[PDB]
UniProtKB/Swiss-Prot annotation:
Effect seen on changing residue 128 to S: In a colorectal adenocarcinoma sample; somatic mutation
Effect of residue 56 to H: Loss of MAP2K1-mediated-BRAF-KSR1 dimerization
Cross-link named Glycyl lysine isopeptide (Lys-Gly) (interchain with G-Cter in ubiquitin), sites: 125
Organism per entry: Homo sapiens
Positions that bind ATP: 15-23, 35
Name of the protein: Serine/threonine-protein kinase B-raf
Consequence recorded when altering residue 21 to E: In CFC1 and colon cancer
Amino acid sequence: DWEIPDGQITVGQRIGSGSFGTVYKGKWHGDVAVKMLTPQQLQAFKNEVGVLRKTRHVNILLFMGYSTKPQLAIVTQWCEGSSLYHHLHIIETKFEMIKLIDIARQTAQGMDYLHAKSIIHRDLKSNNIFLHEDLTVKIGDFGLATVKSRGSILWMAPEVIRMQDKNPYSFQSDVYAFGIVLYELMTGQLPYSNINNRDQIIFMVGRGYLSPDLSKVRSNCPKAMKRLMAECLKKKRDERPLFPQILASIELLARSLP
Ligand SMILES: CC(C)(C)c1nc(-c2cccc(NS(=O)(=O)c3c(F)cccc3F)c2F)c(-c2ccnc(N)n2)s1
């Protein structure tokens, strides 16, 4: 099994909380990430998502094992560096166009893998794309439904925001969230920056009145990159390309660049 013997993990600094559980930097055969959760949270993740079992890919965060005592936790590999969100919006890292294209290429590579294994991320955003050693993209923080009837909206597809569906999530919703990530890479900015109201952004994006300002893309951004971005951000989910097609477009772009 993947159960780490009781008392082997040293738990350190609290990193934060994602879709589910609290992340702490830890030590177990070097630096590791320790995601604390409840047995109900762990069982739901194994059923509703199942990335711990299913994924073993260079662009997906590597699961390592779990602990039962003192507290239940998922132990993954540790990413040395920062998330794409942190790089672009917190510390304003100026990446070369070649690198920005590579980050997109690597993200689309990981997404195509997940989708081929029939896994929908449901919560892809820039603080989920971890730039390990500032070179390798590692996709983590998978979406898990923790709440019922009776949050980062900038990446949500209009249909996800409208939520007139029980499960508005699809491969196409992840394509939209990737579209926003492409926007962030090519502009170095977050969409709808000129609006100071979360409710107005939610209402308008869902109703298709508001969409990212594509005129904000860098001068050195390839025409095909801006074209792919537009296709991924289509308001009609059906009009969006899937990741095998997205990947092929980036891979072709990556070589056609002088
Ligand atoms: C607080 C915040 C921003 C949300 C973070 N979460 C994780 C983290 C820690 C543990 C697991 C998952 N993701 S997960 O829980 O979806 C998951 C697994 F539990 C197993 C395998 C892949 C995987 F993505 C994470 F995103 C972070 C994390 C993970 C690895 N290295 C570093 N440096 N940070 S940071």
